[PDB]
Amino acid sequence: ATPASAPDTRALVADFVGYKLRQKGYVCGAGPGEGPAADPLHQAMRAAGDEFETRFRRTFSDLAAQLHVTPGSAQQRFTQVSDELFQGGPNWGRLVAFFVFGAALCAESVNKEMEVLVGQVQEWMVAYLETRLADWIHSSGGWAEFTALYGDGALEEARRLREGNWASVRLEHHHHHH
Numbered sequence: 001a002t003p004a005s006a007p008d009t010r011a012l013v014a015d016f017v018g019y020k021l022r023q024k025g026y027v028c029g030a031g032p033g034e035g036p037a038a039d040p041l042h043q044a045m046r047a048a049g050d051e052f053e054t055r056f057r058r059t060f061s062d063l064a065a066q067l068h069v070t071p072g073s074a075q076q077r078f079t080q081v082s083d084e085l086f087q088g089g090p091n092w093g094r095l096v097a098f099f100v101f102g103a104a105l106c107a108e109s110v111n112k113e114m115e116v117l118v119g120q121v122q123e124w125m126v127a128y129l130e131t132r133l134a135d136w137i138h139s140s141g142g143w144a145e146f147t148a149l150y151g152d153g154a155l156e157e158a159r160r161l162r163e164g165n166w167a168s169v170r171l172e173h174h175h176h177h178h
Contacts, residue, residue, distance in 0.1 A: 055159030075121040090136040093162040
């Protein structure tokens with residue numbers, strides 16, 4: 001018994017984006033309350049998103065000013081940061097982090113009619129995914145671990161961890177003695 005799949009990974013992506021766009025302008029959908037779904041793809045995607053948004057408080061205004069001062073590049077910068085730390089870290093913390101970025105920088109580059117660069121950021125994503133992320137993914141299989149990851153447990157833990165190592169961009173210089 002091995003079910004098949006017609007849709008594509010790309011489709012799911014454009015879905016979260018397009019929906020997030022109308023979510024502010026013209027919401028369109030249904031009201032899932034007691035409708036058990038085999039593949040909690042949608043529910044899952046929303047969970048992660050709202051997870052980081054609920055975990056902290058004002059990541060937008062906060063991460064805005066804070067990350068503002070420190071000279072940072074565009075979208076490409078956000079990813080580079082995540083991959084920089086996640087470099088060999090199959091932790092969930094980087095999931096909720098790297099995600100909040102792709103999305104935020106997604107709707108931004110999209111709404112601003114900056115799709116040109118948008119398609120670029122994503123392309124790179126799926127690239128490294130099957131490149132070096134093909135292992136950590138093959139182990140858990142994918143969202144599988146995610147579905148059962150945030151099943152039960154304080155969220156404040158996942159954030160503090162993510163914003164902990166990430167926001168911990170503050171380190172100590174070197175000591176030059178003679």
